[PDB]
């Protein structure tokens, strides 16, 4: 879906499989966190479905030793003195010592400030211990978390449930047309993006000889040249668009290992899984009622949450019993208007827009005479190939960007019995729609319930309307205070700040690095996990936020600003929390998840409609839903569901006929599935018979 998804997938630790265990053989104990996973496996990133705990992600600093156990690094403490000596320990090796938590106060020389320090001890025992007892200590605070997990700002303020959801949904981010790095980061974005491998890094230092949208040539210092080709509009495994763009320009000096071109969900080499949106935390006329989301049509107009999706369509021409299927533009009983977009071969041409149902590849297959309906044979007499063209499935639409044709006639090695093969690539440019699913990094998820016009949005003092409106009620229940903090810092990063340096450094910012006391608008910052911005420093920064271009400070030191109802004009009675939050477009879009069926295929054996949108199937009326029906006492609806609307071979046909005729719905027949049941019970030497009220067996 996006580079982070691939990276995590490559760093997965699965318990299932041969030699391991079966899913039916995994108790509540294999799955829950173990004290030995510290620094080795992440206790956050794990599915919440039936595979919870069976699939972990490797911790950040974890490595594997040649024996197979997962080693993690620790700093050796000599005599109450922290050393830069780093040794990797296994689990049982670690248990034979005592290690201190990363965030222990340390002297500039190495000695511990407090005599008592937090310490982990054998068997997963946590307690305080004298400074003279510490053998090793943690490398970094973020030593226990996964790559994804370490990308959650203010993670230390989110509950494990919403944090799991956030780390799992970051992997469902959809690459946007254009990618913006987040204002509020954690430091992991850079190395996540680079190590993910979907960007282009320079192997050796040099200068850029010639740069094009197609390729980038680097003239090394020694004299050699290396050319990196960009991957442009390539179809990902999951229909997301992988598209790399050059960053450097012609004649630019670039060092070894620098990012010269970044790919999807990347910006100057950092993971850009979403966009920075102006957020207002208030209820708004019920359109954001529990976890729904309201968006400004700006995001539609300026393609802010637009993303590309590429579908692959495929058809072949085989040898049949009565001849061979031929791909041809000449199709029986097809107007010249639908065939207008096809080339001479019956293949659609590049650049043609195609709706669902249009022809893409014209293939006709010869049908035998003994396979014709009596009405079909009459209609043939009263007026030998049938239509098997590749049509666009329902719900798909886009520009045809690429074609690929393989012909057994033209050397192309195909499976035996295949003469031609055509693959058509269709790209759709999906704007953000009602019902598309957005989410933040703290498991704060929702769907788009309303996209209002830019003038309706509650707008700030200087007229700038907000972009997204989050309901308040679904915030303090979930315990994802992260976003709150994230929001505030968000604003601080957009406007910047200037701390009052005169009369000394204020007492709250004493611990801040000197680089943070002044910041220009749209500044980039990092909240490292379990380190980073403390609430006090954030309070201060809200106190020293920069004014706008007109010299006005729009947000209060509490973090709230005054907004105006774009619909009535009156200002809203109270101040509202306004800020900037990083929102990601998750890969659960209505364009894919909508479906509907009148009629369609039926399984041969059971004669019940197929399943799945891709097979044009119907929804399943399960046992529980049947109990619901029986509860209401809707007898006729239940019967109609389980007969004429399903596997009543003659009843469904007569229903279709009665609908097109305008007549009444007929009387349901017997389900063919029950006939199947009877024949099976007979196959088990059980003599089942249906008796009439008189007692005679009926057939």
């Amino acid at each position: 879906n996006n580079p982070l998804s691939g990276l995590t997938h490559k760093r997965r630790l699965s318990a299932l499989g041969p030699g391991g265990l079966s899913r039916e053989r995994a108790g509540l104990e294999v799955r829950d966190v173990h004290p030995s996973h510290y620094g080795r496996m992440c206790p956050i990133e794990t599915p919440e479905g039936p595979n919870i705990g069976l699939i972990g992600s490797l911790s950040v600093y974890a490595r594997v030793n040649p024996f197979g156990f997962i080693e993690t690094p620790y700093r050796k403490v000599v005599d109450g003195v922290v050393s830069d000596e780093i040794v990797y320990l296994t689990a049982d090796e670690e248990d034979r010592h005592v290690v201190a938590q990363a965030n222990s106060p340390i002297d500039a020389d190495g000695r511990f400030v407090e005599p008592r320090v937090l310490v982990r001890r054998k068997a997963g025992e946590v307690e305080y211990v004298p400074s003279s007892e510490v053998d090793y200590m943690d490398v970094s605070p973020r030593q226990m978390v996964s790559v994804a997990t370490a990308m959650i700002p203010f993670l230390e303020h989110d509950d494990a449930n919403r944090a799991l959801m956030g780390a799992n949904m970051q992997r469902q981010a959809v690459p946007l047309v254009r990618s913006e790095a987040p204002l509020v980061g954690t430091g992991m974005e850079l190395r996540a993006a680079i190590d993910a491998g979907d960007v282009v890094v320079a192997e050796e230092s040099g200068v850029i000889e010639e740069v094009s949208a197609d390729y980038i040539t680097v003239m090394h210092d020694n004299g050699t040249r290396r050319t990196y080709r960009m991957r442009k509009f390539a179809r990902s495994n999951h229909g997301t668009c992988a598209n790399q763009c050059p960053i450097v320009d012609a004649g630019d000096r670039v060092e070894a290992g620098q990012v010269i071109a970044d790919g999807p969900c990347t910006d100057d080499g950092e993971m850009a899984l979403g966009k920075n949106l102006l957020v207002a935390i208030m209820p708004w006329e019920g359109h954001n009622y529990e976890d729904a989301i309201i968006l400004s049509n700006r995001l539609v107009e300026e393609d802010v949450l637009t993303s590309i999706h590429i579908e692959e369509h495929e058809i072949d021409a085989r040898d049949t019993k009565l001849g061979a299927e031929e791909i041809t533009r000449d199709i029986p009983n097809i107007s010249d208007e639908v065939l207008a977009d096809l080339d001479e071969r019956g293949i659609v041409r590049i650049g043609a827009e195609v709706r669902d149902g249009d022809i893409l590849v014209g293939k006709v297959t010869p049908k035998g005479e003994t396979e014709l309906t009596p009405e079909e044979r009459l209609l043939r007499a009263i007026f030998e190939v049938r239509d098997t063209s590749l049509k666009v499935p329902h719900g798909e639409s886009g520009k045809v960007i690429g074609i690929r044709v393989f012909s057994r006639e033209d050397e192309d090695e195909l499976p035996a019995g295949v003469n031609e093969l055509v693959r058509v690539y269709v790209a759709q440019k999906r704007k953000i729609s009602d019902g598309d699913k957005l989410a933040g990094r703290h498991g704060n998820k929702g769907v788009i319930g309303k996209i209002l016009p830019v003038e309706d949005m509650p707008f700030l003092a200087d007229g700038t309307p907000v972009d997204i409106i989050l309901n308040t009620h679904g915030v303090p229940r979930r315990m994802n205070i992260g976003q709150i903090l994230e929001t505030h810092l968000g604003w601080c990063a957009h406007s910047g700040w200037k701390v009052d340096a005169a009369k000394g450094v204020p007492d709250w910012a004493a611990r801040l690095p000197d680089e943070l006391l002044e910041a220009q608008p749209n500044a980039i910052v990092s909240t490292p996990v379990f380190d980073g911005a403390q609430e006090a420093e954030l309070q201060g920064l809200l106190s020293c936020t920069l004014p706008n271009r007109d010299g006005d400070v729009l947000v209060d030191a509490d973090g709230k600003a005054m907004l105006f109802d774009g619909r009535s004009g009156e200002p809203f009675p109270y101040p509202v929390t306004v800020g900037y939050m990083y929102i990601m477009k998750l890969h659960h879009l209505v364009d894919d998840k909508i479906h509907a069926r009148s009629t369609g295929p039926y399984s041969m054996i059971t004669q019940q409609p197929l399943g799945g949108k891709a097979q044009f199937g119907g929804q399943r009326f399960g046992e529980m839903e049947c109990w619901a029906m029986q509860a209401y006492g809707a007898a006729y609806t239940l019967q109609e569901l389980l007969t004429i609307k399903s596997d009543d071979t003659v009843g469904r046909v007569k229903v279709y006929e009665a609908i097109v005729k305008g007549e009444n719905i007929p009387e349901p027949g017997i389900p063919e599935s029950f006939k199947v049941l009877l024949k099976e019970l007979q196959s088990l030497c059980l003599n089942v018979e249906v008796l009439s009220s008189d007692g005679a067996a009926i057939e």
Partner: peptide
């Protein structure tokens, strides 16, 4: 400064603890 190794954008960190080993 955060991630001062490849040539990346200067993202400033609220870091209080130093990184003795890079990822």
């Amino acid at each position: 400064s955060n991630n001062s190794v490849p040539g990346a954008p200067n993202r400033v960190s609220f870091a209080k603890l130093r990184e003795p080993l890079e990822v």
